[PDB]
Amino acid sequence: MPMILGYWDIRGLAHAIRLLLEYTDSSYEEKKYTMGDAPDYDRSQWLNEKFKLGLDFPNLPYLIDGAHKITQSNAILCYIARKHNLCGETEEEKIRVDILENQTMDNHMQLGMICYNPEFEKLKPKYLEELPEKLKLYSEFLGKRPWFAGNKITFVDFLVYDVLDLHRIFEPKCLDAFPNLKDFISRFEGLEKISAYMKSSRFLPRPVFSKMAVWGNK
């Protein structure tokens, strides 16, 4: 049995999971759900199935792995990471992992909040004002380490990468002030299975968000 990863036919919250899945070399298939166009943005393809998957808190994404039925993107992430020693070894490694796990989710919500907000264009200047600061925190937090946890790559590297990439897309010249972060993107995309996957026809970098979006809905 391969694992099933369920999600909308977009990037969204599955990106880190897909990347992690590939990096770990895990047998799996995606169950992609399509969303209708305006003004309903019909979701019945997912809603017809939402409550019949034995999920405890029906949501997307979800991962199904035989008996284990998982929701909550970070939960899927640590569940997979655990099978391959990537949830962090030492105590220091774990702290950093717990922080970044939630820190990235926050910066992600924040991006997604405006990109789904009809006011998108007016909010953008302020969000761009503050971006440099957000990225500085990551840069300083990474410091001279090869990975965010420390010396070993871990699943939060996938979360941090996704967030950084997203912004390089949103604001091309948004990483230049931080060599080490650009080095991080190199290392990560330089990883063999990551590279191979990025070249494959499975890669799915866009849409970034669902159709409801004002930006990256395309």
Added chain:
Amino acid sequence: MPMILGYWDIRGLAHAIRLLLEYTDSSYEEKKYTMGDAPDYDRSQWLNEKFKLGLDFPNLPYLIDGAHKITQSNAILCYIARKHNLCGETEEEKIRVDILENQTMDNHMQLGMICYNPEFEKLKPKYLEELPEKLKLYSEFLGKRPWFAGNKITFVDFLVYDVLDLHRIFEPKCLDAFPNLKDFISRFEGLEKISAYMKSSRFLPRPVFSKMAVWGNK
């Protein structure tokens, strides 16, 4: 030396952390920060200090424990839980923990979203329409277990409790359709250190949210 827990002089995101601190018998003080009144809810008392605490991602709440400086409520929670074997033993225990860790965070966000929304009064009927459903998921998820992880109490029990309590305070009869959840509230408040603490002058059940709020700002 005692640990410092920093947060607004409210309940908010610290409630689970306070409860957990007491239950584990942890040695700690609070650094409480006050917020100004309308219409600029000044936050300089925290802002004057925000960047000088050696925090990696300055935020509230934070926990300071000698060399370890932590942010992100869930990270503080697991960090403490680990010192006392409460982040989950088995694999099944961990999955459940990871899920609820994020699941509660979501239902909390959701509540906090409308209670901070000026439109509070119009949004309320719709939120109460779904008020139950959400609770049903918890009830079914708990099932016949004494705790949400399984047979051992763990730190998510604190998160789930807070969320259930918050709603009972918002929708009294919002827990009648689910005996087992009321039993959970019994067990939890029935815990000795919990009970003692709830009677102490340290107990801080309100305000629920910051002053900016339309509900539970009082």
